[PDB]
From a paper:
In addition, the NTD and CTD both function in Arc oligomerisation, including assembly of retrovirus-like capsids involved in intercellular signalling.
To further characterise the Nbs in their free state, Nb E5 was crystallised, allowing for structure determination at 1.42-Å resolution. The structure shows the typical immunoglobulin fold, an incomplete β-barrel of nine anti-parallel β-strands. The overall structure is compact, and the three CDR loops extend from the protein. Despite its elongated nature, the CDR3 loop is rigid in relation to the rest of the protein. Furthermore, the two tryptophans and the basic residues in the CDR3 loop suggest a negatively charged, buried epitope. The central disulphide (Cys24-Cys97) appeared mostly reduced, possibly due to radiation damage. Upon further inspection, it became clear that it was partially oxidised, and was refined to 20 and 80% occupancies for the oxidised and reduced rotamers of Cys97, respectively.
Author numbering: 3 to 120
The structure:
Amino acid sequence: EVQLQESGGGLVQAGGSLRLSCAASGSIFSGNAMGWYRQAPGKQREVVAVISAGNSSNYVDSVKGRFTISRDNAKNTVYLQMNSLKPEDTAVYYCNVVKRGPQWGMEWGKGTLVTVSS
């Protein structure tokens, strides 16, 4: 029982663009920082971008200038606009609430798959 669902992944060539979306229960989303994470095979999910309920955003250096995170508070939905995609962006992407402390032990949705062809 998770309260999140991601969509919008696809296969694209390098230089392409995608827009991911995640709809979440208001009880997870409302008033709370939300983030996009990505996972490649064998590895932990790594946070990519985060957005506060007051629209403050954070990004890992390697996606700055390329990705944009946003939220629609009336639909409890978070978005990740992914431009200038690179093979190093190939991963399963997940959204979740961004809690204090380490992220271990949360329940996750199914993710959405993004492949950027070599």
